[PDB]
Amino acid sequence: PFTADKGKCGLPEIFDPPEELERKVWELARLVWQSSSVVFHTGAGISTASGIPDFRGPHGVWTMEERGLAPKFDTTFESARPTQTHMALVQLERVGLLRFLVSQNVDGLHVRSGFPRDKLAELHGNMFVEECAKCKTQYVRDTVVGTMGLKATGRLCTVACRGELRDTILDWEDSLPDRDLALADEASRNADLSITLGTSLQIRPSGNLPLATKRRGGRLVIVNLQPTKHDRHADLRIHGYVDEVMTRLMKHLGLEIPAWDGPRVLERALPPLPRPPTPKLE
Amino acid sequence: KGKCGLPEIFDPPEELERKVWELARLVWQSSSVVFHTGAGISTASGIPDFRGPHGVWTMEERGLAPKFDTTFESARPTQTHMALVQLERVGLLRFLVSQNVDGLHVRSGFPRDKLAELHGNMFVEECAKCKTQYVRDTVVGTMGLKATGRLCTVACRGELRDTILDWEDSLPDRDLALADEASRNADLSITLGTSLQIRPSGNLPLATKRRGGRLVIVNLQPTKHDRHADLRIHGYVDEVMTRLMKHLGLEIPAWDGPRVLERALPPLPRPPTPKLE
């Protein structure tokens, strides 16, 4: 809690220079095309471009705490817009180039971006979601659930039940949800490409799931401004703003990054849309 | 560098809700609305401000660095940026004055002939001879009005220089005159994300007061002229502008990607006006 191991905070940022950045995002493009089963793992770095501070970056929550300073929010959780990266992941899932998405974020922007819930594992919970203690029915609300650490919110289940509604925000002691951790674990083992965006991969086991892609010869790409726990296991490390890496990647894939309709909830992935034909790689 | 790192104020929801309704009334009641924007309308796209808690000057005074969560090239316009584009298209915004050099107003497709970029635009270089501007797709690599290395290509070969003013540099006369003219003639100035400490860029909203115009200030910190405002709103500008638009019955439009529009298009249809009192 107070004393919890918050891991390495405030490490130096690394910027790949343009030419080397340009060539790494082509290598990423080549890996996406070549792969049958692409899982994305996201952390707090995909939401900074929308005004929400990270945990272990230069100006992150834990970093500034060690220095006796406050993290700063440039928006509310309710007024946060999904980033170019968020929407990019929405399109990649609609054209069938993303099998599964595993996010350690509680900021709720994945769900709000319209990404389908049955293809998302929210390992650390969601600030807009409360859950019936009795029947496990989840409610995706339009404002943040007012509590953290899996406590009574004040509201009751309304299914065909009256059970106690509770927040989904894990405390330090709280084990991951079983459904999300099994679906994230299964997707990770079976993938032949895991890509990590904006996570420093220091948390167990959320950070270890990308290593499961390595077993049976799968490839691993790490996109991050700072060093990550598992940098040495990566076949490709890109050091750049994820928005810049994801817009350049989409351009290579010949994909437009769609308009954000405003807050929308999609329970179940739709049928896959048409996608460009694949380049000849050799 | 003026007063930096002042405490933030948050209006409570009920009060915030009420003030943005009072904003909505003033927009509807007003013949000629000008908006004045500063660094605060780009924070939510990952570009730090100057005198906010984590801003350039603040962090300098405390021997710390300002943090960028994007490049200038990869920055997307905020919900506020795109709201100003729609307000202009439906004829409820006469003019827009910005102290921002971040280039996002132009890239949002807001029309140049209705914008004054008082402190310059990092994506614009200007011919020293014929004053032809070039809006490029990557930041012009200099600041302080220096030669960039590139030449005029008009029907000229003159020296292209950046448009970023240094401290000593006088504002561009065209942009300052148009900004000043629009400010005097407006019956509503709204300021969004500016602390209004810079001369004269910060004083232009006060010219709206002369001949009984109204002034709204939307800002998280105190501003120089809080005392002259008929309405002060302490909230995230994005929240204020999305709630405001919702009252106006206006969608906030999709961003096509970087686009340059020289001249304002014909005004589009807008919802009918409420009966006010």
Ligand SMILES: Nc1ncnc2c1ncn2[C@@H]1O[C@H](COP(=O)(O)OP(=O)(O)OC[C@H]2O[C@H](O)[C@H](O)[C@@H]2O)[C@@H](O)[C@H]1O
């Ligand atoms: N715009 C950007 N582009 C690319 N990388 C970025 C950007 N902004 C930040 N980063 C990088 O993004 C990385 C973010 O890493 P961390 O801050 O540790 O977040 P987590 O999601 O891994 O934290 C996991 C859990 O830990 C907590 O306890 C909670 O329970 C969280 O769920 C940094 O290395 C940045 O350099």
Ligand SMILES: Nc1ncnc2c1ncn2[C@@H]1O[C@H](COP(=O)(O)OP(=O)(O)OC[C@H]2O[C@H](O)[C@H](O)[C@@H]2O)[C@@H](O)[C@H]1O
């Ligand atoms: N999301 C937000 N919502 C509302 N207000 C905000 C937000 N983020 C920041 N603010 C406020 O936004 C304000 C930003 O104040 P300053 O940083 O002085 O920006 P300027 O444009 O007025 O500076 C003018 C010139 O001065 C420089 O030298 C350069 O020349 C500039 O061009 C703060 O008061 C924040 O509380």
Ligand SMILES: CC(C)n1c(/C=C/[C@@H](O)C[C@@H](O)CC(=O)O)c(-c2ccc(F)cc2)c2ccccc21
């Ligand atoms: C002013 C504007 C173009 N301008 C500068 C630029 C600021 C600095 O290069 C000059 C300043 O430090 C010294 C002086 O006062 O003359 C920065 C900026 C600040 C810190 C940073 F790490 C990178 C860029 C900046 C950021 C957002 C908007 C406008 C900005």
Ligand SMILES: [Zn+2]
């Ligand atoms: Zn129930």
Ligand SMILES: [Zn+2]
């Ligand atoms: Zn010329």
